[PDB]
CSV table of C-alpha atoms and ligand atoms in Angstrom, one decimal:
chain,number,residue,atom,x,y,z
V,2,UNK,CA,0.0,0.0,0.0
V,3,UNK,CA,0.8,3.9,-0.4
V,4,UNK,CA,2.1,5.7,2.4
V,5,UNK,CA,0.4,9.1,1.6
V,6,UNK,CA,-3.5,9.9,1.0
V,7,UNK,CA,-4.5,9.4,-2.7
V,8,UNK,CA,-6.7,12.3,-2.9
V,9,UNK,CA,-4.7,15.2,-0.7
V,10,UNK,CA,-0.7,13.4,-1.0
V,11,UNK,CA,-0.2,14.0,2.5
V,12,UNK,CA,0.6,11.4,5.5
V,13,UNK,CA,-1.4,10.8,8.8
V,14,UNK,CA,-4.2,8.2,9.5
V,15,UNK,CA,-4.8,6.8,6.4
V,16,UNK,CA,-7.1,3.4,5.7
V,17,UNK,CA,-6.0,1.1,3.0
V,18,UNK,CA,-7.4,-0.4,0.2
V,19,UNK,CA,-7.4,-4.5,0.0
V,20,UNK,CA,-7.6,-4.4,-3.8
V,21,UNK,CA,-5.2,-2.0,-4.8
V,22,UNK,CA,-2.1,0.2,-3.3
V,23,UNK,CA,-4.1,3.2,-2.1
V,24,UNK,CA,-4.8,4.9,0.9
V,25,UNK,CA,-7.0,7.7,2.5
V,26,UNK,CA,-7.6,9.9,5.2
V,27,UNK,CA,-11.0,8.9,6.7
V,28,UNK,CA,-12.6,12.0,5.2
V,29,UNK,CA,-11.0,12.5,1.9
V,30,UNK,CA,-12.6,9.3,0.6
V,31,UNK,CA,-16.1,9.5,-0.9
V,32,UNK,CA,-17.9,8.4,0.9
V,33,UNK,CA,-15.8,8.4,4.0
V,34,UNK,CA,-14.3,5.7,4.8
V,35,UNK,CA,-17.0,2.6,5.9
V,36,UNK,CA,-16.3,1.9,9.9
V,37,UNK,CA,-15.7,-2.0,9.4
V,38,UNK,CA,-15.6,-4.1,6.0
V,39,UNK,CA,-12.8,-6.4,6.0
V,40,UNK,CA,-11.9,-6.5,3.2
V,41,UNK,CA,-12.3,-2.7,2.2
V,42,UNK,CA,-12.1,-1.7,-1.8
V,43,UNK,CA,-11.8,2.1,-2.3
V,44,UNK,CA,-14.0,4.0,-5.1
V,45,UNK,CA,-11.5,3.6,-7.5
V,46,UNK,CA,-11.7,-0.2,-7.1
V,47,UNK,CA,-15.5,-0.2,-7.0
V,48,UNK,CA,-16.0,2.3,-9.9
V,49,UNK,CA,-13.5,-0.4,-11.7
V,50,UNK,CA,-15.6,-3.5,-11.4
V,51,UNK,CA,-18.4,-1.7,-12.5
V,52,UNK,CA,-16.7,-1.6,-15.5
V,53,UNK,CA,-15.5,-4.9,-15.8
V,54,UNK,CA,-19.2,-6.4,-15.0
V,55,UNK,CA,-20.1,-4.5,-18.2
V,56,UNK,CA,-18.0,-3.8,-20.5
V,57,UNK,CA,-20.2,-1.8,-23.6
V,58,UNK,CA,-21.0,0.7,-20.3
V,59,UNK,CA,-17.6,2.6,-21.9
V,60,UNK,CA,-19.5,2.9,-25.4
V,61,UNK,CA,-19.8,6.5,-26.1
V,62,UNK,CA,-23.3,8.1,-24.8
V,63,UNK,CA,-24.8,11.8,-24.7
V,64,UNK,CA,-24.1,14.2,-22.2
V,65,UNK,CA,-27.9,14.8,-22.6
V,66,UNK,CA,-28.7,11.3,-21.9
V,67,UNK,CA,-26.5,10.8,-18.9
V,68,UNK,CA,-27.8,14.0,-17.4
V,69,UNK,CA,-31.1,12.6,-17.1
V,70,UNK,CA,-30.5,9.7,-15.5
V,71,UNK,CA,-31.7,9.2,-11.9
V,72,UNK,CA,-29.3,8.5,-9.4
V,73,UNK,CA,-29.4,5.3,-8.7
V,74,UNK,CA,-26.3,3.5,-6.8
V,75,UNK,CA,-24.2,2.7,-9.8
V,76,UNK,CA,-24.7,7.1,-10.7
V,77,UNK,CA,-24.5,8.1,-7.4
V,78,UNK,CA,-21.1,6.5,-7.0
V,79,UNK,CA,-19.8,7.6,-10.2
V,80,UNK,CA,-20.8,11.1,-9.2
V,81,UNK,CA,-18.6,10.7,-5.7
V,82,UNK,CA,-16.0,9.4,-7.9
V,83,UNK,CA,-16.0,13.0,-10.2
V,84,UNK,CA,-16.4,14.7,-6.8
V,85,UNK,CA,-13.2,13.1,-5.4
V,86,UNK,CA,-11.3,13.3,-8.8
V,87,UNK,CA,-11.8,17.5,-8.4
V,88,UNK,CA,-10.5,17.0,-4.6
V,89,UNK,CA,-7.0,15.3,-6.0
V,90,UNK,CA,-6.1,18.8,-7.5
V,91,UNK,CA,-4.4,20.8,-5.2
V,92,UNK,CA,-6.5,23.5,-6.5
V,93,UNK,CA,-9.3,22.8,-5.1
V,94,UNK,CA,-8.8,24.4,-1.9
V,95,UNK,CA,-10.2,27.5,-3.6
V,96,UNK,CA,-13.2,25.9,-4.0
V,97,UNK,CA,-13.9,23.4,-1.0
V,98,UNK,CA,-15.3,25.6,1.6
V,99,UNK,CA,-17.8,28.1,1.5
V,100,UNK,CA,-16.6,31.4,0.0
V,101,UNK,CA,-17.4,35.0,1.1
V,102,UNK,CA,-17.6,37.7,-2.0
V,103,UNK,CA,-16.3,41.8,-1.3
V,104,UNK,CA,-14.6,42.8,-4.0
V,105,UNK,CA,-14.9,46.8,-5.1
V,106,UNK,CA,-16.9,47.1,-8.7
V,107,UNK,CA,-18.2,43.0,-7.7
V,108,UNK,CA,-21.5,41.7,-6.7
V,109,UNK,CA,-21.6,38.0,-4.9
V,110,UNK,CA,-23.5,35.7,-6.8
V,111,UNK,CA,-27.3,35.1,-6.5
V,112,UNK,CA,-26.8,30.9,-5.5
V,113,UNK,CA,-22.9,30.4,-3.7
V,114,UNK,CA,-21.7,26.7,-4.1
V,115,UNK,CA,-18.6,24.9,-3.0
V,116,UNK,CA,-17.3,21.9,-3.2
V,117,UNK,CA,-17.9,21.1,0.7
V,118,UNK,CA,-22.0,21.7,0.1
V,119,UNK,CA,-22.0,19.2,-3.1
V,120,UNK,CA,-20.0,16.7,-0.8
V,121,UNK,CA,-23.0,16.8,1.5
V,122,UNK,CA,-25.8,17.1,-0.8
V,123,UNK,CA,-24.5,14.0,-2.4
V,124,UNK,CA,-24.0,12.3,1.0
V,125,UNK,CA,-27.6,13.1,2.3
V,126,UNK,CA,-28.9,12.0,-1.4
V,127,UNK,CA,-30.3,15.3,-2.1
V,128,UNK,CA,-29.7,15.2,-5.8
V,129,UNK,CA,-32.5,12.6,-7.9
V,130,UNK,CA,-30.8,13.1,-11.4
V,131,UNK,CA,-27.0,12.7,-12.1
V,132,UNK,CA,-28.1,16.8,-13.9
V,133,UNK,CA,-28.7,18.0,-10.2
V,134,UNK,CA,-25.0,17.4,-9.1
V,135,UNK,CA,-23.7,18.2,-12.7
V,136,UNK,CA,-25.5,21.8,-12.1
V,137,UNK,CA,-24.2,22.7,-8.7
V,138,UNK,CA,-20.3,21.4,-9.9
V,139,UNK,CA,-20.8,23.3,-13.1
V,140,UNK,CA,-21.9,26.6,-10.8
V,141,UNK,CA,-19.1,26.6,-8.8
V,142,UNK,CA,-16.8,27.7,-11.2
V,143,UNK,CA,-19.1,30.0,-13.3
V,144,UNK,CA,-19.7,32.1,-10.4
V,145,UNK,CA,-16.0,32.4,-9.8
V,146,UNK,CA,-15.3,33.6,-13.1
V,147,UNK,CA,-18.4,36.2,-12.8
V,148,UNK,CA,-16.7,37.8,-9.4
V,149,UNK,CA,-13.3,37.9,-10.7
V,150,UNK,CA,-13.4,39.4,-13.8
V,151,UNK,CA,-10.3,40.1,-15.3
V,152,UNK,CA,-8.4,39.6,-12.2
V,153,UNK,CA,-5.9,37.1,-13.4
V,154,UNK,CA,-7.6,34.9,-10.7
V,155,UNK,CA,-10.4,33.5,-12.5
V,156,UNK,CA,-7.9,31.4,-14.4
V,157,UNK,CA,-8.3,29.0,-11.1
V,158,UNK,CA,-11.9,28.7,-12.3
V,159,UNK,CA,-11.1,27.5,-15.6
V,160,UNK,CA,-8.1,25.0,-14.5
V,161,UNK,CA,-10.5,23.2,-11.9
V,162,UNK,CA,-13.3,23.1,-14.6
V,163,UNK,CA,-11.2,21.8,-17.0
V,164,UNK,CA,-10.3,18.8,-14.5
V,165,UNK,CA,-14.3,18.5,-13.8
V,166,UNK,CA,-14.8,18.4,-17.4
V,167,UNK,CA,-12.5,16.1,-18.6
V,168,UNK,CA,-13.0,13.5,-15.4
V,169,UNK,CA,-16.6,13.9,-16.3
V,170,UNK,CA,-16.1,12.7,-20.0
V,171,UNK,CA,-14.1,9.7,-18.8
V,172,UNK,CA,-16.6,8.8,-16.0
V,173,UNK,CA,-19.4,8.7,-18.1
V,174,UNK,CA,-17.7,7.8,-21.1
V,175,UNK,CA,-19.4,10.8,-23.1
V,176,UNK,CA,-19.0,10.3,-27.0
V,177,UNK,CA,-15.8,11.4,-28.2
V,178,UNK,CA,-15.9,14.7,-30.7
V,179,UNK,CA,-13.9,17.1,-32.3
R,201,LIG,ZN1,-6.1,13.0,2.4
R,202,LIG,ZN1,-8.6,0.3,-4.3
R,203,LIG,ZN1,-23.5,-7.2,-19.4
């Protein structure tokens, strides 16, 4: 096994995976990390065999299509899975926990979102189609690149979207285009 947490590359108290080399802090797997379970398989293992079990699940689909769907266990883990893929960029910690907005010639946005709030929505099962988390994820970087302007900081917004975006096309195995 790894001797540093997958998701934040620090050391501490970490829980290993039976199936593969990884290791977590308690709270930086999604979901936390289960009390007993012997063996334990992380999400990367899980989100793996759900592959495996079937295979023409990685033929392209429509972003419109997996949108729609309801979140049933097999969605509601993939979606934990994009969540924790956004928490292995350092770069997250701008986004994690909730932000506070007084900047001269800003307003705040109407709806705030962090990361922390979708990590509980998703936990309490607040979100019935995979389009509910997609939303709040998506909104999190919009309204940083509506407060910051031209400040050169609203390149953060695009890095960590870019990350979302791309984890989100391989999660869901979205259609390949130009
Ligand atoms: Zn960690
Ligand atoms: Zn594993
Ligand atoms: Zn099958």
């Amino acid at each position: 096994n790894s001797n540093i947490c997958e998701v934040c590359n620090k050391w501490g108290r970490l829980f290993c995976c039976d199936t593969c080399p990884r290791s977590f802090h308690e709270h930086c797997h999604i979901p936390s990390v289960e009390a007993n379970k012997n063996p334990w398989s992380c999400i990367f293992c899980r989100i793996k065999t759900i592959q495996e079990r079937c295979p023409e699940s990685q033929s392209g689909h429509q972003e419109s299509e997996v949108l729609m769907r309801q979140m049933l266990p097999e969605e509601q883990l993939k979606c934990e899975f994009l969540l924790l893929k956004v928490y292995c960029d350092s770069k997250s910690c701008f986004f994690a926990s909730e932000p506070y907005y007084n900047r001269e010639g800003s307003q705040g946005p109407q709806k705030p979102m962090w990361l922390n709030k979708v990590k509980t929505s998703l936990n309490e099962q607040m979100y019935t189609r995979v389009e509910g988390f997609v939303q709040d994820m998506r909104l999190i970087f919009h309204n940083h690149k509506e407060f910051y302007r031209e400040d050169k900081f609203t390149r953060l917004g695009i890095q960590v979207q870019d990350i979302f975006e791309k984890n989100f096309r391989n999660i869901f195995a979205i259609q390949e285009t130009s």
